[PDB]
Amino acid sequence: LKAPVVVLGAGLASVSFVAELRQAGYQGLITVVGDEAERPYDRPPLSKDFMAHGDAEKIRLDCKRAPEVEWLLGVTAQSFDPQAHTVALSDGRTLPYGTLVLATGAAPRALPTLQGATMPVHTLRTLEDARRIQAGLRPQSRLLIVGGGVIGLELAATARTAGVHVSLVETQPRLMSRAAPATLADFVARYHAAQGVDLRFERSVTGSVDGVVLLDDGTRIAADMVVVGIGVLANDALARAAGLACDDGIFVDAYGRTTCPDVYALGDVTRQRNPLSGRFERIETWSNAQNQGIAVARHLVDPTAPGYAELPWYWSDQGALRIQVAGLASGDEEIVRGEVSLDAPKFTLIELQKGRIVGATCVNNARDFAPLRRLLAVGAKPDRAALADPATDLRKLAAAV
Amino acid sequence: LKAPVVVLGAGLASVSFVAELRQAGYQGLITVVGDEAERPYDRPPLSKDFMAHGDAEKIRLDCKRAPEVEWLLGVTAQSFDPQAHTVALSDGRTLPYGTLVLATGAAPRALPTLQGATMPVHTLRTLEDARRIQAGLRPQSRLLIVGGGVIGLELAATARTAGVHVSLVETQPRLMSRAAPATLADFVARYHAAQGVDLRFERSVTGSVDGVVLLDDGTRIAADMVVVGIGVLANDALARAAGLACDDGIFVDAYGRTTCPDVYALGDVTRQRNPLSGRFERIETWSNAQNQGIAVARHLVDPTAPGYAELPWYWSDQGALRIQVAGLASGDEEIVRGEVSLDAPKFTLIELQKGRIVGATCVNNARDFAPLRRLLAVGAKPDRAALADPATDLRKLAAAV
Numbered sequence A, B: 001l002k003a004p005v006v007v008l009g010a011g012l013a014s015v016s017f018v019a020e021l022r023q024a025g026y027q028g029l030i031t032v033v034g035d036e037a038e039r040p041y042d043r044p045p046l047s048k049d050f051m052a053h054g055d056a057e058k059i060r061l062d063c064k065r066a067p068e069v070e071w072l073l074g075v076t077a078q079s080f081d082p083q084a085h086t087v088a089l090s091d092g093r094t095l096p097y098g099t100l101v102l103a104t105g106a107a108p109r110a111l112p113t114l115q116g117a118t119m120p121v122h123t124l125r126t127l128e129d130a131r132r133i134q135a136g137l138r139p140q141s142r143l144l145i146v147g148g149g150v151i152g153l154e155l156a157a158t159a160r161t162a163g164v165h166v167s168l169v170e171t172q173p174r175l176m177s178r179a180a181p182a183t184l185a186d187f188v189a190r191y192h193a194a195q196g197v198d199l200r201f202e203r204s205v206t207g208s209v210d211g212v213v214l215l216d217d218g219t220r221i222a223a224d225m226v227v228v229g230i231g232v233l234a235n236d237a238l239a240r241a242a243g244l245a246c247d248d249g250i251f252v253d254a255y256g257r258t259t260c261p262d263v264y265a266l267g268d269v270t271r272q273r274n275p276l277s278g279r280f281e282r283i284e285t286w287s288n289a290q291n292q293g294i295a296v297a298r299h300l301v302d303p304t305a306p307g308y309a310e311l312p313w314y315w316s317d318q319g320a321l322r323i324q325v326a327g328l329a330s331g332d333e334e335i336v337r338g339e340v341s342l343d344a345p346k347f348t349l350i351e352l353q354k355g356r357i358v359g360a361t362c363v364n365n366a367r368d369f370a371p372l373r374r375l376l377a378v379g380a381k382p383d384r385a386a387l388a389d390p391a392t393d394l395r396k397l398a399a400a401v
């Protein structure tokens, strides 16, 4: 930890990192460069309460645990020279650094087939995006969502509540193909279908002509607006240009170190080890952005602290469904607690591999999720009969370990 | 480049690296730790002339361009402490380092289904392996090879020349699935089949009982010996334990830097950017081991030197077939020069992507390979008609650029 600290990006990962630096006891200079001209804010409300209600002052990140930080908002870092230890800014200034931290996140993938479209086509990542989409979410208007990931599905629910007609096109045979158990994805499709979402599986966009979207089965979908949510790509251009190892994401170890000395990276921009799978992965979760930012800061200030070690997990709020998912989507066995039903949805899934818990899902069952994450963290091997039995208290089981 | 230099592993990558350090002008200490108790040697002859003729003194690497190096042969590096800058050795000694270089290569993957086998099962990576296999390559004996990669196929040819009966089992529908054009792989299968190799495609080993190998189609193969060649796994255990980013291979940038300061890696142990695909890959080629070792050394001594930038390529000598392959296995177009025929095999393949050469293959046409690699390196876009036309001289075409 060499002063001064410069952080590129002013999202959740950055805010979490800088607050932890200060809390851990680092009092040297911190400067954060943020390309969006916005008070740092949280993104999940953009598909939900902000989309529905439009108050950005409800979604700002709390920066008060990060005192004495200069936030350069509306400024783009254009390059860094890792030999000179400088960052070149879009406003013509240069920042010196002792330690450089890349927290630049990821940007929505565009749809190459809609590149020359004339009808409104948006992605949903920023406050600017959300405002632009909202301005067109008229009751009885027709929205097409491309991509059946959590963001698209969150938007689908919000749009339906607002009285917007929703069609959704997914290239895969299922929704949430990235990190959701099949049982969950199947149920989620049944739910959205029941709420009026027109789901198209195993279809891809091939183009558009004058307010109509074209599919690879040779059919058409009319829409007033398309929102594209087919995933993100790491914002790793500065790292690539400066000679760091990256591949749609900057490779980091558990300390957040890149291949370039004095340069760290954290959050959505990173490709990191998933301890459960043992493989490198770009983890895109809110929990990772916060916790990885915190762990990297803690170890920078206190080198005796352990590296980042958390197992991945996320939530997704989709209308009546409060979904929580931890760990791996599958193992050699899935245990189901409760009925899987559209009538008052409430259930839990537990994924086991050789007797060990490797993943869990809770739908409208937050109470069970925390204990399951604890059991997951220690690689617990509980009695499978007990895991299935509705009389079992999971909090009691997690406490017994 | 901080002295002293310690290199772990004494294979081709290591030898190439240390020779380049000396040639580039570094005269500080160099110590190489090599777990095999063997004068450093080259591996390709192990499937060919060494297997056939058995003289290890024909296959030693020339270390004379690496004067004043202490080679600790028959010694295993057990751990390194990247804070203390020390390496712990199996003989009880500790080495200090200014710069640590991990050149530990990769080890054959074992077949989990043959783990408890009673019949002879070998892999082919080391001189010890090759000697052990040779001692059983009796004329008219029955060899089963698992895996249709270049090493297995090289061994298949050598065994057939020696009068050994050869069966080969491949899980994929084709041979050389890793980095060979389909046209090449198809031809290679026809060739080996014509030489008496019993090829089994889309079959996997499920086990063995008393000198018989069992397959997943529910059938049996009797063999006097099994040689397993289903790929390798990076020898990255020391890196993993020391906190470096790795995923079946140590992630490095074009300077050979790992995520740990003062620790570099090169050769088969590394996962690195393939500039053609733009993706990270563990490149397993002889050319990579040598050239990446050389490039990393050059840049350590002269930081103004460029990073490693070579495009991947390999050869494979399979009986009558002298195969050379560069770049990507496919593009949007393949051009074929010559007839593809078992009668005096001689042909060239050129892979193009949007008019640009992205790959080439030569079979018994070494003359054409060097020019094609030059055209590949610059991303040349030659006339497709000219590329097809047998009157075209490729050396003249590469010279014109």
Ligand SMILES: Cc1cc2nc3c(=O)[nH]c(=O)nc-3n(C[C@H](O)[C@H](O)[C@H](O)COP(=O)(O)OP(=O)(O)OC[C@H]3O[C@@H](n4cnc5c(N)ncnc54)[C@H](O)[C@@H]3O)c2cc1C
Pocket: A008, A009, A010, A011, A012, A013, A014, A033, A034, A035, A036, A042, A043, A044, A045, A046, A047, A075, A076, A077, A078, A103, A104, A105, A106, A124, A125, A126, A150, A151, A154, A235, A238, A266, A267, A268, A269, A284, A285, A286, A287, A289, A313, A314, A315, A316, A317
């Ligand atoms: C609509 C939406 C809904 C979501 N809902 C959920 C959910 O239900 N569950 C869940 O787990 N996650 C949710 N996510 C939250 C998401 O997980 C977090 O926003 C993300 O993980 C935070 O990561 P980050 O801070 O690394 O990146 P970011 O939030 O992307 O921040 C990086 C910042 O750096 C900026 N930047 C990039 N390059 C430069 C440069 N060169 N110079 C200066 N600045 C630069 C970017 O523009 C950006 O502002 C949702 C996200 C969106 C967009």
Ligand SMILES: Cc1cc2nc3c(=O)[nH]c(=O)nc-3n(C[C@H](O)[C@H](O)[C@H](O)COP(=O)(O)OP(=O)(O)OC[C@H]3O[C@@H](n4cnc5c(N)ncnc54)[C@H](O)[C@@H]3O)c2cc1C
Pocket: B008, B009, B010, B011, B012, B013, B014, B033, B034, B035, B036, B042, B043, B044, B045, B046, B047, B075, B076, B077, B078, B103, B104, B105, B106, B124, B125, B126, B150, B151, B154, B235, B238, B266, B267, B268, B269, B284, B285, B286, B287, B289, B313, B314, B315, B316, B317
């Ligand atoms: C049978 C065979 C045939 C081949 N034919 C071809 C071919 O036709 N075309 C082609 O391109 N390539 C061929 N290859 C050559 C291959 O490409 C090279 O041998 C390889 O790329 C060299 O890489 P390396 O030096 O990084 O690793 P290695 O050669 O594996 O050397 C690493 C050395 O480090 C040692 N080591 C590992 N851990 C430790 C430790 N902790 N302490 C001390 N030492 C350690 C290993 O035991 C090993 O001796 C063939 C290889 C084999 C085995």
